[PDB]
Ligand binder design. Structure first.
Ligand code: FAD
Ligand code: FAD
Lengths: 622, 622
């Protein structure tokens, strides 16, 4: 029954969050154990085979900078690479890759399979062990049960999910996988609140039944970009293009005629295609993408045609488009409904506020997307391994990582939509960029021992480069009567009228970095342009960064002021009943987090501070 | 409900038999449809990751010679290659390959995914449609149902299987896959007889917890062999070795002490390890192999330590061996029990004798092993596509293929062991070799259109080579007083005493082929030694082949004399009651097949022939 070796941390579920949690826990020198249903599914993509995008590439870069694997399994599995918002400011660009599925699966499995201090085990779980608000050990299906000092759950969408097609349904965790039914009941009996969500995916087409000779092609950028701060372009496999098609009035007529057979007729947008036509009935054209699932299989994923209509309607819609006159379907489209937990009963370190040692990550945190789970899993594993070693935990803030924004929003949003990350959703966009993620996370990774020697050496060299470039550009001066100033004045507007300097010379918006590096002064730029772009970003954004920094420094006291979960706001005088109910329901962790809740005003926080000072539950508030 | 396109043949289950059936049916120019649970499992190996062996390599060669895929997916996925019985006569050699699992899975999937006239579909089946002893169409789970002129079932071990560990059990098709429960009931209600069998598999070890520094290594053959008659050695990936270890008295003591916890305490041999110790208690040492599952994962398969004991005993046995003092297990060992059909109610063309159009192949035919299913599936698909096109079927005999022996034995054996192919199990070993499989099967493949142009050209060139070599060796003559005969007499015993010839010169057993080719006469051999070995085999085995040929030619009349399944042997005078019951139970297809049944004597077949002549159910018997 009892396994004769105790472990530090146990992860239940090796999906997109469990793998990151296990890697982070094992790399931090703690004995790690990973339980999963079945192997060879590690790294499986059950949806659109794409990685990154607007708001998703930032999370990938954050995971990579702190010692992740998602950004390294994609450099050897991407079949198309593009940069989004390339023409705009560097703070908003993103990198999106159409990925070969098998290469990604194998990179993930092989990287995870050779990780020291970690062991994997193929078995389901059926219950957990808890006494005195402490979780110790998990129970498998055969009868064998383990013991550990910390447990992380990364079930995802397998918590008692049903597949829905048309008006019919059947049990299933996804296309071809079984459901984890009893664990749903076992977690439900625990004092938690559980709900249900539903999302769908379109069918798959056969590439040798589509006449691509009349379909428009689309390509990526000529210089293929990279995700990780370590690899280069020599690791990418061969490239393939994508095909673009459209719909026509016959498709809309068929959808409207057969709209009766649907469970519906809901997010604030339109995920399906019948929603696309009904919400906007005047539009008569839509864009559909056809992209290959890999360079060695002829299955095409259609993007933009997701629905929940029965099979006959699916076939008619597929067969009523240009280039799809005679098409075959290998995998029908379908939706799924799964359980989740409301993210208002766990600490910002992704630990349940009621149980000691229990952690949550992945889809069960009311989110969606591959990138929205890896960061949660990595942070959960980090905190779990810190706790098992009896040291203080860690959690990022809204001003240094998109993960901090994601956690804070999931804690104090209260909406019902699946959480999708967007660039504008964060208030510190101008500094929370992609190229500087390592510059603001790898030192923390090194302090907690998540970063090995190669990354440390690379970052030290890069920082030395940046500092030397800053100093040398600060060490130049020009005058209008300078011997070489004729050409300087020639190709620069507003010619020099006083002592000039490169740090001030570049302040003009029209000038660039490489142009200034090509000059009689301002000697040739350093060979590592990856470090060179940093100085350009800093000089262009110095004013806004300074304003935001002195802004952030002011709320630090409210960030530090903690509020214990045992607090009973009914014992506070001067606060309205609605505010008391709201604060009792949310149970924030800090006064600043409470202030971010909708419905609380500065009067409420002032009265709360007065009450805290009265009860002595605060050392000081300055 | 009804799918708007009718197909020629539908295969249910894309495993090891379904893929071959689909490829054979599609390559024969018939619209083929393949239903499966889930994709990315095509080519999965759920047991010892090895291909070929004694009696299994012959089946692989037969499948390859007739247009199969198993021999082509192994040349790009094998991590170790060996020849068994290399020192013995060429009629008994075999080729065994330790295979990388992922490369095999991907080769299979990519080869199957680009097959013209074939389409794949991911869905389970829940029932079949039959009227007036005819099967037309199958019903899926969602509700969509198809129509076809022929149906082939390749379920394997998923017909309502239970996983067993120790004294506990749970439903499962295998480790990580769901069971197909309702189809078992639907097939059971049909007038068939169904039974249950059980087999097990050992656990998996982690390669980075075993001290291989004190373990013996094993190697293959430097001159690498080949499976397919098309590829070469340039397609094989990098090679890895295998590790050898043993057991000791502590393991036996632990097994004996904890023998009480076992469902048992059965084949005529010992599959498990507790059987190994109990059946032979005097032996105190056993051989265990540790082999890598691939060149990119550190999971080790242990061969020789299969059992059904609970997990604690498994861990003790693993930890009580040299080099395994501190070992980890990633996948526990387990057994499974599954349903099957008794192979006495189907024609030798793998068609049920009662239903029209229904075919059986794979594990449901009471067999085991990868190679024992591919041939069955290929022949079933061949016969199904012949039937759907309204042409006469085909079935090999015992004298031209191991498939004929396998089918004949499964029809008229009556034992209960899982059927394993062995070389000595066939009575025509001396001609049913491996190197000549194409020479006796590819012309039939071409006649039925299973062979494309490349194989046809290669075989035509090879046959031309063989014929020219035979003629040139027949066109030589030597004399004792020949000018170059001094050396001939020097290195050959019994010097020439009369007119000699190479067709007679090689008749000496000590002489070889290459030695004669490097002589004054008998000019250098042809560059294609693959054709050159054939003439050596023919000249060494001519007498035995001639004897066996004139033997086989005599039973052809009994082979041709068919016996309809509607025959009622109770209406025959002069036969004993036991013989009547036996013949009614078996219902053979031919008088020769009936004669191969145990318990019938030549008197019975003579009386049967007399009765057939009386009733006029035979044209003639000569
Ligand atoms: C029908 C469908 C629709 C989708 N729609 C969208 C969409 O609209 N938008 C979008 O962004 N993404 C969508 N997706 C993709 C989805 O977000 C991801 O595939 C996945 O849910 C995110 O990964 P995860 O780690 O959070 O969960 P998963 O990858 O589902 O985590 C499950 C993994 O953990 C293992 N596991 C789980 N529970 C246990 C347990 N108890 N014991 C042991 N092992 C366990 C499983 O074996 C598996 O390996 C969709 C997927 C499907 C199938
Ligand atoms: C526990 C265990 C023990 C084993 N022991 C041995 C042993 O002792 N000796 C040995 O030689 N081999 C052994 N094996 C290996 C086994 O013989 C092969 O893995 C396999 O059973 C033979 O392949 P098959 O094609 O006959 O069947 P399978 O590979 O089992 O065929 C199943 C395939 O068909 C599909 N399928 C099945 N039914 C349906 C359906 N209704 N609809 C759609 N798709 C369907 C499945 O999705 C799957 O792809 C063992 C395997 C296991 C798991």
């Amino acid at each position: 029954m009892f396994y004769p070796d105790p472990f530090d941390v146990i992860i239940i579920g090796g999906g997109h969050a469990g793998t990151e949690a296990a890697m982070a826990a094992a790399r931090m020198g703690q004995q790690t154990l990973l339980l999963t249903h079945n192997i060879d599914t590690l790294g499986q993509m059950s949806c659109n085979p794409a990685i990154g995008g607007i708001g998703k590439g930032h999370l990938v870069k954050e995971v990579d900078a702190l010692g992740g694997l998602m950004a390294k399994a994609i450099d050897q599995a991407g079949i198309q690479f593009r940069i989004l918002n390339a023409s705009k400011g560097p703070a908003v660009r993103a990198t999106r890759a159409q990925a070969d599925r098998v290469l990604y699966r194998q990179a993930v499995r092989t990287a995870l399979e050779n990780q020291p201090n970690l062991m994997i085990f193929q078995q389901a779980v059926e219950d957990l062990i808890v006494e005195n608000d402490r979780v110790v050990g998990a129970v498998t299906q055969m009868g064998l049960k383990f013991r550990a000092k910390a447990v992380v759950l990364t079930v995802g969408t397998f918590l008692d999910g049903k597949i829905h097609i048309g008006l019919d349904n059947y049990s299933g965790g996804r296309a071809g996988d079984p459901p984890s039914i009893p664990l749903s009941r076992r977690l439900r009996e625990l004092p938690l609140r559980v709900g249900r969500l539903k999302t769908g995916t379109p069918p798959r087409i056969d590439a040798r039944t589509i006449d691509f000779s009349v379909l428009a092609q689309q390509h990526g950028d000529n210089p293929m970009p990279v995700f990780s701060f370590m690899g280069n372009a020599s690791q990418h496999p061969q490239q393939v293009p994508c095909y673009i098609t459209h719909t026509n009035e016959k498709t809309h007529d068929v959808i409207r005629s057969n709209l009766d057979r649907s469970p519906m007729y809901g997010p604030r947008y339109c995920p399906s295609i019948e929603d696309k036509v009904m919400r906007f009935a005047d539009r008569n054209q839509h864009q559909i993408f056809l992209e290959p699932e890999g360079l060695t299989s002829n299955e095409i994923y259609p993007n933009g045609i997701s629905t929940s209509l029965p099979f006959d309607v699916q076939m008619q819609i597929v067969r009523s488009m240009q280039g799809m006159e005679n098409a075959k379907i290998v995998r029908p489209g379908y939706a799924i409904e799964y359980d989740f937990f409301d993210p208002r009963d766990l600490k910002p370190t992704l630990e349940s506020k009621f149980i000691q040692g229990l952690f949550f990550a992945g889809q069960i945190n009311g989110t969606t997307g591959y990138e929205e789970a890896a960061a949660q899993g990595l942070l959960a594993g980090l905190n779990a391994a810190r706790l098992s070693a009896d040291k203080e935990g860690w959690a990022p803030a809204r001003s240094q990582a998109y993960l901090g924004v994601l956690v804070d929003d999931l804690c104090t949003l209260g909406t019902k939509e699946p959480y999708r990350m967007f660039t504008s959703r964060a208030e510190y966009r101008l500094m929370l960029r992609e190229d500087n993620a390592d510059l603001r996370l790898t030192e923390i990774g090194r302090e907690l021992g998540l970063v090995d020697d190669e990354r440390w050496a690379r970052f030290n060299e890069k920082l030395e480069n940046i500092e030397r470039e800053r100093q040398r550009l600060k060490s130049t001066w020009v005058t209008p009567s300078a011997e070489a100033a004729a050409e300087v004045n020639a190709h620069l507007t507003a010619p020099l009228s006083r002592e000039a300097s490169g740090e001030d010379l570049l302040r003009r918006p029209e000038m660039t970095y490489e142009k200034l590096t090509t000059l009689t002064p301002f000697a040739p730029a350093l060979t590592d342009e990856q470090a060179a772009e940093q100085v350009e970003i800093q000089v262009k954004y110095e004013g806004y960064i300074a304003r935001q920094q002195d802004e952030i420094e002011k709320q630090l006291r409210n960030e530090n002021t903690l509020l214990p979960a045992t607090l009973d706001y009914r014992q506070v005088s001067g606060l309205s009943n609605e505010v008391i109910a709201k604060l009792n329901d949310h149970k924030p962790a800090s006064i600043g987090q409470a202030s971010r809740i909708s419905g609380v005003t500065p009067a409420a926080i002032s009265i709360l501070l007065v009450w805290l000072k009265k009860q002595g539950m605060l050392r000081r508030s300055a």
